[PDB]
Design a protein around this nucleic acid. Structure first.
Lengths: 47, 119, 56, 139
RNA sequence: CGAUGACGUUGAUAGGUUACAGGUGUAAGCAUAGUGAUAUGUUGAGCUGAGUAAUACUAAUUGCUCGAGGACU
RNA sequence: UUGUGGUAGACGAGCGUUGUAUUGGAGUUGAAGUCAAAGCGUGAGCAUUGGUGGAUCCAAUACAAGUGAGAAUGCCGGCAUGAGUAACGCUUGGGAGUGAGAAUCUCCCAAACCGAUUGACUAAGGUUUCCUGGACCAGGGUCGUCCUUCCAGGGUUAGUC
RNA sequence: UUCUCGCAGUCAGACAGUGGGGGAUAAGCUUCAUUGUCAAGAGGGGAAGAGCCCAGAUCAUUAAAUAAGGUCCCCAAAAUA
RNA sequence: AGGGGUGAAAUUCCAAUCGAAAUCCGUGAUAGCUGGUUCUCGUCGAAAUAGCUUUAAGGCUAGCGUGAGAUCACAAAUAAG
RNA sequence: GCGAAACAGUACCGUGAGGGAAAGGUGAAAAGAACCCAGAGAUGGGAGUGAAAUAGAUUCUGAAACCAUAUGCCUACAACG
RNA sequence: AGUUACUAAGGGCUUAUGGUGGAUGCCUUGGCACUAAUAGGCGAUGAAGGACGUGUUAACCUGCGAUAAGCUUC
């Protein structure tokens, strides 16, 4: 069966790409909160 | 049942029996399963008796049960048979070959036995 | 079907009483003197009589 | 005697091996190797190797004879287990256990160590009572 | 499956050998004619997954175990 | 003398555990703690001895309890049970060799399949899982000397693609 | 058994009989008042009988008298007219 | 893009899930309702009634039962007249 | 005890909001079991060091439930919280 | 005629023994609450934090930054 996740990595890079998330204040706020959460991965380009 | 393996089937069993009889004719000793080796010996003896007539009808009969091997081939099988194998047992009316019960199989503990022949 | 209780040690042991085991059938090989399994060849090469198999 | 040789927790189901393990008890060493050398059991080659190692240990390490050694006791001690998942219907992903066993066998030569353990327990309880009533002397 | 029963080498228990009933039907090849579709003597021809008799030709071995001294009044 | 049956509930007397300053003590000539025993208490507890363990503990008076564990379809962990149970998830055979170990190792050859795709260019995705040598604990629904297994080494080369 | 103070707990009772109702004077029914039980009380009988009868359990006793009730056996106890 | 969107309408679908997705916070929201709250011993020892309640398996008051305070036999029943 | 004494925000999961665990202790100094033996080695056993191998790397100790073994006791005519 | 043995497959009753199990007995260069002196920023001269690299030292952690597990003055 075709599953609900079709991994088109271009869409992922446009989603969790830094400059993609840098264009919104909410994205930056969430990234800073996750940095406070000491997560090893911050974006798809920063793991 | 739904789609699954056919496994052992009458056509599969007869093809396997043909394979074993051809192999035992080629070499002379075959380690196999005794349960099917009973009928394998039956058919081997029947064909050997049939092969003793040594005519063109006999060549046609042998035509139905030959398959090639690594080196020994069907033409070699027929030639060697009609040369010295079938005439060898002309003095023996039945009871050609013998099966000796080997140990159980390592993988499935099935009764493996070795079929051989002498005259 | 389904069980409303479990199995106990005594009952499983009494069931396993028929899970008991047996012994083989043993004969003596003289040319290669050893207690082999009866009605079968020995590992040395002789079901009976003449050497019908190699050393192993 | 003991003449033990541990296998020390290899992957093996105790339930299956313990069957032939309790088969071999009571029997002598020589009268059991011949019958063991024929059965098509996955728990038979390992026992044959264990028997060979134990015979060597008795003959050389403990200087035993071997003409009178018998299987004093065979046990399949409880070993640890590993948990794995299985692809089932509806993605249940049930858990399957993989069992090990601390395998060891005992070989005896002397006709003793049957009531000798009882006498050792008697010596221990006599030490207990001597320690107790010794403190009871001149109380 | 356990198990019932017979035979276990001096063996007729099963199997191979020929023999028979029965059945598939006229076979392959040879010769005849029609170039060929075709039929003819062979040809009521074979053998059988399993039916039946002898034959030890083979296997069930030149194997091992429990199993008897009659307790007590 | 009433008595000593009495839930809800009212009420009374207590026991132990730790640390808090003690009077004191023991301890590699064995402490806490563990197992057992054929002790004392109506009981909260205390012994005593025997075994491991080799380094801390306790007797008596007030303090505080994250203090005293029977259930909460109580929480976690371990161990079972069912139980060798349903099944082992689209398919063969023989021969030669290696290994100590042969159906899960290799090699020779047969039947069976797809063959409008069980062939191939590839895209995208996994993004070195690819190759050689060693080994096969661990993943392989058994299997092992074998892997698309792990390790060591190595590998994809653009002027027009 | 009255007052003072605090703490409760219960209003969600049941069973059999007595005087009743409603029902259907039917109910192992219901709203009641009384008796007794349990709840808050086990004990002996009724083969067992949660609410009937006898009856009110500090404990141990291998002592007796008793109550309901029973005395051919289980199961304790009897015969005489 | 969710007191939103999509929808040839079926409350279709919106990350295997939709009377209006999931996620963190308010939040330990509330819970007349469920479920449970662990050492010992000793004594006394109810109610399931009445009244009220957007009140009926909920709550409240007198009541009882107990601890304790007071009265002291003039009080209360106890049985007879 | 901050989830956070081990390389914990680790791993893992949902692409994404976010959730988010687990495990330390040899010995006194490895001073890590040389020697010898079975086997392919792993492993195990005598040997030795080491006070101690109840100090062998699953490394301060190592409970019970659970799994087995054996001293004795009985049970394969038995209606059994 | 009477009659109890052996049997025991296995079970359970007591005892001891061995295996997980980590539990208590003990502790931790570990977390928790604080007290007290200090201070409350850094940065376009490009902060931090990451990627990348830097081994006589394979990997990781850490330090470091093309001077790259470290340099200069005192």
């Amino acid at each position: 069966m075709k599953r609900t996740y079709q991994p088109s990595k271009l869409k992922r890079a446009k989603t969790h790409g830094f400059l993609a998330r840098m264009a919104t204040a909410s994205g930056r706020k969430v990234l800073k909160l996750r940095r406070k959460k000491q997560r090893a991965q911050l974006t798809v380009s920063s793991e | 049942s739904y789609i699954n393996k056919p496994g052992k089937t009458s056509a599969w069993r007869v093809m396997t029996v043909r394979q074993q009889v051809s192999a035992v004719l080629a070499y002379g000793k075959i380690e196999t399963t005794l349960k099917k080796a009973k009928n394998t010996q039956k058919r081997l003896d029947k064909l050997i008796t049939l092969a003793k007539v040594d005519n063109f009808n006999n060549r046609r009969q042998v035509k139905k049960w030959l398959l090639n091997t690594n080196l020994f081939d069907v033409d070699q099988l027929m030639d060697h048979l009609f040369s010295k194998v079938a005439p060898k047992y002309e003095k023996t009316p039945g009871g050609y070959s013998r099966v000796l019960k080997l140990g159980p199989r390592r993988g499935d503990a099935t009764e493996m036995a070795i079929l051989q022949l002498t005259d | 079907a389904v069980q409303q209780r479990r199995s106990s040690k005594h009952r499983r042991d009494k069931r396993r009483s028929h899970d008991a085991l047996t012994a083989q059938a043993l004969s003596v090989c003289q040319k290669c003197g050893k207690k082999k399994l009866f009605h079968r060849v020995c590992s040395c090469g002789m079901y009976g009589d003449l050497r019908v198999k190699k050393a192993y | 005697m003991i003449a033990f040789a541990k296998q020390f927790r290899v992957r093996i189901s105790p339930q299956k091996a313990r069957l032939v393990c309790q088969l071999i008890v009571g029997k002598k060493t020589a009268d059991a190797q011949n019958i063991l050398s024929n059965t098509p059991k996955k728990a038979a080659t390992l026992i044959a190797k264990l028997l060979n190692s134990a015979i060597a240990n008795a003959t050389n390490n403990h200087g035993m004879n071997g003409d009178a050694l018998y299987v004093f006791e065979c046990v399949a001690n409880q070993g640890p287990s590993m948990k794995r998942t299985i692809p089932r219907a509806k993605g249940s992903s049930n858990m399957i256990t993989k069992r090990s066993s601390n395998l060891v066998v005992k070989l005896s030569d002397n006709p003793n160590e049957r009531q000798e353990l009882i006498k050792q327990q008697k010596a221990l309880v006599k030490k207990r009572v001597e320690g107790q009533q010794k403190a009871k002397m001149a109380r």
